[PDB]
Ligand SMILES: CCN(Cc1cccnc1)C(=O)CN(c1ccc(OC)nc1)S(=O)(=O)c1ccccc1C
Ligand SMILES: CCCCCCCC/C=C/CCCCCCCC(=O)O
């Protein structure tokens with residue numbers, strides 16, 4: 001008898017079986033998965049990155065609503081009734097909307113941290129303190145900007161002589177204007193503005209990481225060289241009509257203010273009055289400013305130990321140069337990436353480079369000679385230092401260079417995998433939150449569904465959009481499992497230790 005009056009009162013929806021099944025599944029997967037995300041980062045020091053601290057924040061927001069909001073949303077969508085009283089009518093929508101804000105601002109800070117790391121020339125000194133500060137800000141801002149949402153939620157009773165009633169929890173507005181302006185702002189803040197800004201940031205990240213950085217490691221590879229470096233250097237100098245000696249190469253456009261050939265040509269003039277010059281060989285490859293081409297050709301004419309190549313060389317020829325010269329001179333004024341240094345170093349050539357940009361990122365004190373950009377006397381001094389180094393075995397130096405370039409290349413690949421995972425996370429968020437965000441706008445800004453001819457269908461769309469929001473929480477740990485080997489390994493460790 002006790003279930004009877006309630007079943008007479010609560011009219012079943014034909015699809016409640018699948019709604020309940022889908023909520024139970026999402027509940028279990030989101031709870032276990034997001035807890036294991038937190039456990040993986042907290043227990044394993046190699047997982048401590050700013051990115052993963054933000055991911056932990058995302059997983060905490062998702063645990064919060066999985067436990068406090070999802071069960072209530074299921075009951076409401078099944079019964080169209082609010083059972084939980086007035087205070088929880090404010091608290092539960094408040095937690096839900098706070099968590100949406102936390103999620104999207106956390107995704108935003110993830111995108112900014114990757115943009116500063118990859119696209120901005122500088123680097124933050126703080127990492128974990130900066131992440132902590134950002135997370136605190138995210139929660140403070142989120143809790144404050146959703147105060148209005150908590151203010152407008154109210155319980156209302158409706159009496160269909162009355163013998164019955166029902167109570168719903170809903171936004172209470174005085175007038176038609178306020179909900180329109182409020183839900184415009186709500187849409188911009190939770191969905192439209194951060195998504196547009198993150199799409200822009202990840203497009204620039206993609207363009208820098210995939211199109212402006214990286215080296216083809218299957219090609220720039222010493223496996224393709226034959227004989228000893230001594231044999232190849234001797235062959236190289238024989239083919240270029242030069243005597244044996246310490247061999248320097250430059251390759252790049254000829255200009256004033258970018259690639260530095262002007263600095264190198266001045267450095268050669270400085271060196272040319274010194275007796276050490278006679279031990280040095282220069283190979284200068286490039287094309288561009290005709291006054292600089294003429295300066296270079298004038299030097300080639302003056303000096304038997306200077307050769308200038310303005311013709312186009314195949315990449316295989318260049319690889320042979322990198323694998324036989326002693327040093328590569330990279331006297332850039334400006335060099336965001338420094339592909340020349342990575343290619344040369346992969347092949348054992350030791351770089352002498354300006355301390356700018358990506359050259360400064362790549363080259364350490366055991367893997368090259370850094371010089372102040374723009375300074376021919378400094379470059380001349382570095383070339384003299386390289387001559388003196390070359391009077392002894394350079395093997396360990398060449399090995400250090402190869403290893404550093406491989407390690408830098410590995411880091412680029414790792415950043416690509418992480419960025420790809422983060423873009424998939426963003427795409428899945430955009431998808432999971434599109435229906436509820438657009439339904440909310442159509443209903444509250446444009447007044448759709450006011451007097452609808454098919455309330456059943458509209459109600460079904462809203463119920464699905466709510467489920468899809470919680471399903472996002474279940475999806476994120478699954479994404480980390482497929483696109484991060486580090487998360488995949490710690491998840492497997494968890495499932496294997498408990499079974
Ligand atoms: C104004 C908030 N909003 C729009 C919205 C856009 C984008 C992302 N989340 C919510 C809503 O649709 C409304 N909200 C809502 C409903 C169900 C649900 O399930 C994921 N999520 C949110 S609500 O006002 O906080 C509310 C109302 C009545 C009962 C429970 C809840 C949570
Ligand atoms: C994805 C892994 C799935 C694990 C298997 C467990 C599946 C259990 C799901 C819950 C079934 C819920 C169906 C109950 C609906 C009954 C409808 C009703 O009578 O009101």
Ligand SMILES: CCCCCCCC/C=C\CCCCCCCC(=O)O
Nearest residue numbers: 015018019021022456457460464467
């Ligand atoms: C085994 C788990 C299944 C996954 C659950 C997916 C959750 C689906 C949520 C409800 C969508 C409602 C679809 C109802 C169709 C229209 C009903 C109607 O028009 O009256």
Ligand SMILES: CCCCCCCC/C=C\CCCCCCCC(=O)O
Nearest residue numbers: 028029032033477478481482488491
């Ligand atoms: C007995 C299983 C039921 C418990 C569900 C556990 C919650 C799921 C949490 C994260 C799922 C990640 C696992 C996906 C594995 C496939 C990926 C792969 O093969 O590399």
